[PDB]
Amino acid sequence: CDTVDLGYQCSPATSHLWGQYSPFFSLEDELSVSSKLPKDCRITLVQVLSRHGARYPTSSKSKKYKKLVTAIQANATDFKGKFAFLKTYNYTLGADDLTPFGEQQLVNSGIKFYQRYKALARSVVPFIRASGSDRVIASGEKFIEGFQQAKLADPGATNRAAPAISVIIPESETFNNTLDHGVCTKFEASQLGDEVAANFTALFAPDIRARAEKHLPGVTLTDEDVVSLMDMCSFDTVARTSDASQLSPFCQLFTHNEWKKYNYLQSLGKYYGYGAGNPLGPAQGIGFTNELIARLTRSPVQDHTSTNSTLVSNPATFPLNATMYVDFSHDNSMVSIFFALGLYNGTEPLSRTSVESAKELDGYSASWVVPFGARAYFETMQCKSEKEPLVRALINDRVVPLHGCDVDKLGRCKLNDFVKGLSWARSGGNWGECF
Numbered sequence: 001c002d003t004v005d006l007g008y009q010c011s012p013a014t015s016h017l018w019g020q021y022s023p024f025f026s027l028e029d030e031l032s033v034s035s036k037l038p039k040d041c042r043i044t045l046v047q048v049l050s051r052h053g054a055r056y057p058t059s060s061k062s063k064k065y066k067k068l069v070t071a072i073q074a075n076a077t078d079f080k081g082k083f084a085f086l087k088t089y090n091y092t093l094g095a096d097d098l099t100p101f102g103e104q105q106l107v108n109s110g111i112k113f114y115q116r117y118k119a120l121a122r123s124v125v126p127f128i129r130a131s132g133s134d135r136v137i138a139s140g141e142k143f144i145e146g147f148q149q150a151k152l153a154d155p156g157a158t159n160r161a162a163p164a165i166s167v168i169i170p171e172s173e174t175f176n177n178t179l180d181h182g183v184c185t186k187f188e189a190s191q192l193g194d195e196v197a198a199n200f201t202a203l204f205a206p207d208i209r210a211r212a213e214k215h216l217p218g219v220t221l222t223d224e225d226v227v228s229l230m231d232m233c234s235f236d237t238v239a240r241t242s243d244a245s246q247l248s249p250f251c252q253l254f255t256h257n258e259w260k261k262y263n264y265l266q267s268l269g270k271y272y273g274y275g276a277g278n279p280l281g282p283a284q285g286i287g288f289t290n291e292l293i294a295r296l297t298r299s300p301v302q303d304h305t306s307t308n309s310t311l312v313s314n315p316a317t318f319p320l321n322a323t324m325y326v327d328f329s330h331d332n333s334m335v336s337i338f339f340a341l342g343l344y345n346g347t348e349p350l351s352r353t354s355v356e357s358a359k360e361l362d363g364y365s366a367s368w369v370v371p372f373g374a375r376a377y378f379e380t381m382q383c384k385s386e387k388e389p390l391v392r393a394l395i396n397d398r399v400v401p402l403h404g405c406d407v408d409k410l411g412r413c414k415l416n417d418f419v420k421g422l423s424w425a426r427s428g429g430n431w432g433e434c435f
């Protein structure tokens with residue numbers, strides 16, 4: 001179901017509609033020109049920003065799901081139609097960690113990165129950081145395994161030293177971490193994302209609730225419970241087999257149209273929680289944006305948001321000339337970073353009452369942007385066509401045309417023009433509003 005090149009391709013009428021719980025699926029050529037290296041161009045730098053792989057529910061969500069399944073089994077006097085499996089379903093999902101399928105997604109991502117950037121990767125040991133979450137570190141380790149596997153199979157590789165994770169950045173309300181939000185006090189108190197999500201859930205869940213209760217006489221559900229049952233479709237799928245090759249029985253409880261609504265609920269939560277829908281959402285991505293500027297320009301970091309001055313000032317923890325960089329992070333920070341970079345500046349604020357497709361949203365959705373195992377590549381290339389280095393952004397293989405600069409038909413801008421266009425991040429944006 002899942003391959004190095006194309007990601008997850010089984011049951012796409014369901015599995016591509018789980019938002020940030022969808023396994024990565026390649027968006028090569030989807031509302032986009034090819035991501036192939038253009039003729040007479042050579043990559044000179046690449047930054048990768050990768051999410052962790054498919055995981056179990058968080059400890060708190062796992063407790064909530066198990067509670068619900070138990071109550072359904074305690075209360076139902078019959079389990080009708082496609083709900084029949086719920087009589088004997090045994091809840092055994094873990095918590096927080098990667099699933100085996102999620103580990104393999106990250107091995108695959110490391111193979112794909114090597115293959116795509118083979119010309120550089122043959123001689124380069126990437127500089128790697130990970131946010132301090134066990135699933136994120138484990139994802140970095142699995143990516144490195146895949147990178148090394150591919151490099152070992154290439155008789156043209158000259159430097160095969162294994163890359164280490166050189167920096168693990170703590171996750172704390174008081175540690176400035178560009179790969180995980182947490183220090184912006186006002187933002188952390190925001191309820192906007194949850195409120196938008198709750199409002200949209202109240203629109204679509206009642207009809208599903210009524211149908212589920214009809215097939216489970218004796219059971220009383222809430223709107224929240226409907227969402228839990230829908231969450232279980234993704235979590236059970238990515239856990240129950242090593243290769244996620246069998247759709248969970250939870251999945252067919254809901255129709256394709258209902259999956260489109262769930263997919264949009266996820267997009268809304270991310271847009272209003274972490275993206276431009278939140279007044280301090282894109283501010284969470286300023287620190288990484290300034291780190292990326294420093295790497296692209298081979299210059300010291302200029303930032304007073306969520307960079308750590310000690311870490312960015314030491315070449316051991318922040319080299320300015322490493323040619324390949326790979327950072328491991330989470331969905332929410334990645335959303336903020338993509339918005340801070342201006343990559344979704346063609347997306348209109350999402351309707352809170354109506355489902356809008358990724359097409360109508362200029363390529364934005366949670367499943368297109370931050371699926372499990374999501375990756376972004378930020379390239380600098382030197383092309384015969386142009387004296388100045390050109391920048392290109394690929395999000396899950398889709399070319400995402402740059403905003404703020406004189407962009408070409410291939411989605412690229414000249415390096416200096418691109419950096420000039422990031423004036424908002426370069427100034428620190430509205431970070432002061434945090435406090």
Ligand SMILES: *[C@@H]1O[C@H](CO)[C@@H](O)[C@H](O)[C@H]1NC(C)=O
Pocket residue numbers: 174175176177308309310311
């Ligand atoms: C910055 O990093 C240093 C070195 O790891 C750490 O001791 C310090 O607590 C960090 N400060 C903040 C605010 O992140």
Ligand SMILES: *[C@@H]1O[C@H](CO)[C@@H](O)[C@H](O)[C@H]1NC(C)=O
Pocket residue numbers: 192195196199352
């Ligand atoms: C949720 O719906 C209520 C009542 O319809 C509305 O007044 C409120 O502003 C909505 N909240 C958000 C965050 O959209």
Ligand SMILES: *[C@@H]1O[C@H](CO)[C@@H](O)[C@H](O)[C@H]1NC(C)=O
Pocket residue numbers: 068071072074075218219220221
């Ligand atoms: C099961 O029954 C108990 C006792 O009446 C009730 O409080 C609970 O809400 C029910 N749960 C479900 C999911 O039906």
Ligand SMILES: *[C@@H]1O[C@H](CO)[C@@H](O)[C@H](O)[C@H]1NC(C)=O
Pocket residue numbers: 176183304305306307308309310
């Ligand atoms: C962490 O960032 C805050 C501002 O967001 C700043 O007060 C602090 O000095 C920074 N600390 C370090 C070590 O970068």
Ligand SMILES: *[C@@H]1O[C@H](CO)[C@@H](O)[C@H](O)[C@H]1NC(C)=O
Pocket residue numbers: 340341342343345403404405421422423424
């Ligand atoms: C993206 O749009 C926001 C809101 O208009 C603006 O503040 C920001 O400067 C834009 N970014 C780029 C890179 O053009």
Ligand SMILES: *[C@H]1O[C@H](CO)[C@@H](O)[C@H](O)[C@H]1NC(C)=O
Pocket residue numbers: 127315316318319320321322
């Ligand atoms: C490039 O120079 C940096 C300082 O910016 C230093 O850490 C190192 O010598 C080089 N980076 C490597 C080896 O990746």
